[PDB]
Write a protein that binds this DNA or RNA. Structure first.
Ligand code: MG
Ligand code: MG
Ligand code: MG
Ligand code: MG
Lengths: 154, 153
DNA sequence: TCAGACTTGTCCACAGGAGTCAGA
DNA sequence: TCTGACTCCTGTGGACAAGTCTGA
């Protein structure tokens, strides 16, 4: 478990509240138990001109990747264990996205228990809904009621 | 001259580098000596549904204002003296806009000497170009060359 | 099977100016 | 004469999703 400097976390929190994104998704997964697959993503977006800034994040956080998409680049972290480690330390300093951060951590922690009963999996899918609600969601398709539709059918 | 807490300045620098803006403008003015005036602006933009965040920023900074326009709100500060003191303290923590901040500080400090010679004023307007060059400028009109043309009269 | 690397798409929520105006 | 408040606007540079595919 990596320990991060406080001044680094304080600046980064401000930058994340601004140009960052804490994302919780429910993805279609045919080769799956409940035909769905949870996905948690911490993301920092920046113009490719300033990709160097995102590249530094990979070294400073110790994990994650940088991908290009159009005229824009993104730092990307979805691996659960270091994500949980990173968000735990970052959370006390977030102002706009603190609740999204806490919800993701909660999803991550109660993740294996959710992969038992279909009811518990659906309860966490509602936690995912709340994250999307807190964000400025605009193109969401798969929700908890989408899961329930494929759940109450079988 | 107020002195800001370091943790506040560290978070703020992050949010400024992300959703904020450091703007230098050359505005036409028929009443002024060189037909152009300078305006420096510290800007923080956010959606109106989060105007409260900008409202807190007014209280914490202790100066500036919040304006609305559409579904988007803005904290802004153009008053030179508090701007200089604010940017002086924020500067060392900035990463993406550190240069813009230093140029604004430089412009402010050379403002009295700028109202003396046209060449020196052009030099200051040149510094305004650099800030715009550092920003993601897309709708800029009046530049130092605009001043050069007018000065040639 | 399944988390995790990586791509593509859309709609803004920003950034970064342009102006005008009152009062100093 | 001169500054700062204040409004309006463009053109993105973000945000927040949607997805494919693979290795063990
Ligand atoms: Mg933002
Ligand atoms: Mg919302
Ligand atoms: Mg930004
Ligand atoms: Mg530029």
């Amino acid at each position: 478990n990596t320990k991060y400097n406080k001044e680094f976390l304080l600046y980064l929190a401000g930058f994340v509240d601004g140009d960052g994104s804490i994302i919780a998704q429910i993805k279609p997964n045919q080769s799956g138990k409940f035909k769905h697959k949870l996905s948690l993503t911490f993301k920092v977006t920046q113009k490719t001109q300033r990709r160097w800034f995102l590249d530094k994040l990979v070294d400073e956080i110790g994990v994650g990747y940088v991908y290009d998409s159009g005229s824009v680049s993104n730092y990307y972290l979805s691996e659960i264990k270091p994500l949980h480690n990173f968000l735990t330390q970052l959370q006390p300093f977030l102002k706009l996205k603190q609740k999204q951060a806490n919800l993701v951590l909660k999803i991550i922690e109660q993740l294996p228990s959710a992969k038992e009963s279909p009811d518990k999996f659906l309860e966490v899918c509602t936690w995912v809904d709340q994250v999307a609600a807190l964000n400025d969601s605009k193109t969401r398709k798969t929700t908890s009621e989408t899961v329930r539709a494929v759940l109450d059918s079988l």
